[PDB]
Structure formats: C-alpha cells, structure tokens
Structure 1
Amino acid sequence: GRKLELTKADTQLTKRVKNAAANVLRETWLIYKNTKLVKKIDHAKVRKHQRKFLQAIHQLRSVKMEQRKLNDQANTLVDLAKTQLEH
C-alpha cells in the first residue's frame, strides 16, 4: 500500500500578479534611472521609488505564498481521497 507516502507537490490572483509585476519593472527602472542615469542624485526621488519597489516585490511574494497555500489545501483533499485506495 501507500503506507506513509503522500501526494507529491483564478482571475483575482492573476490580476494581482500582472499589476505587481508591472510595478516591479516600473520601479526597478526608476531607481536605476535616478541612481545611475542622472548627473545629480535626488534622494527624495530614490526613497519614493524604493517604497514603491518594495511594495510591488512584497505583493508578488504574497501571491506566491497564497498559491503555495492553495496547492497544499488541494494536496490535502487528494491525500484524503487516496486513503480510499487502501484495500
């Protein structure tokens, strides 16, 4: 039988991903431009884009963690269904 083995490891989440990923691209570019493509670095500008950058990166991490959570909830149900294979 299966003994101690277990299963091997949505528009809303997709929407969250596309907007956050576009924001990562936007903010990476603006931090790069304001730190490397200017004659004089404006620190207020760099702080603003760093805040927008971290918020976009952390939004993508939040979606990925939610997808891992959903995947394990699904694996839980598949594991429960597989208990019936024990005959």
Structure 2
Amino acid sequence: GRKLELTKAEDTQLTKRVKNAAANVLRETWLIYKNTKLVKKIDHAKVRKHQRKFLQAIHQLRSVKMEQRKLNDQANTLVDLAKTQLEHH
C-alpha cells in the first residue's frame, strides 16, 4: 500500500491582486531605472518614492504566491485524507 507516501505537490480575487501588483512591478522598475540610470541628475526623493512602490508590489506578489502554496497544501491535505480509504483490505 501507500505506507508513508503522500500526495506529490507542485481564484478571482487573488488573480486580480496579481495583475495589478505585476503591472506595478513593471511601473516601478521602469521608473526607478529611469530615475537612476537615464537622468542627468538623480532626484533621490523620486527614487525613494518609487522604491516604496516597488517593494510594495514585489511583496504583494510574494504574498499571493505564499497563499497559493498554502491553498495547494490544504487541497493536498484533503486528497491525502481521501487516499487513506485506498488502504485495503
């Protein structure tokens, strides 16, 4: 039987979170790049502002990913419990 083996691993709201956060990663990556590499004169207040927005977007995508890993393990928990019924007779 399955002995000690377990299910092998690996939403609308979460998806919405993703497109908006990912667009802002693009936005802020571009604006940091522009303001640090494409200007004659670096405006540090501007860079700070876009660094805050950049980290917020990146960390939002991390949060989504972590939640999907959590959801996936919850689903695998349900499947593992179901699979205990495969142990017969």
Query: For the superposition of Structure 1 and Structure 2, which TM-score range results when normalised by the shorter chain?
Result: over 0.9
- CA–CA distance in 2 between the matches of 1:8 and 1:44? 48
Unaligned runs of 5+ in 2: none
Residues 1:28 and 2:1 aligned together: no
| Percent of aligned pairs with the same amino acid | 100
Q: Alignment partner of 1:41: what SS?
A: coil
State the 4+ residue runs in structure 1 displaced beyond 2 angstroms.
none
- CA–CA distance in 2 between the matches of 1:52 and 1:63? 17
Q: Find the counterpart in structure 2 of residue 52 from structure 1.
A: 53
Q: Find the counterpart in structure 1 of residue 5 from structure 2.
A: 5
Unaligned runs of 5+ in 1: none
**TM-score (normalizing by structure 2):** 0.97
Aligned length: 87
- CA–CA distance in 2 between the matches of 1:73 and 1:43? 45
- CA–CA distance in 1 between the matches of 2:84 and 2:24? 44
Quote the offset at 1:13 in angstroms: 0.4
CA RMSD of aligned residues (A): 0.4
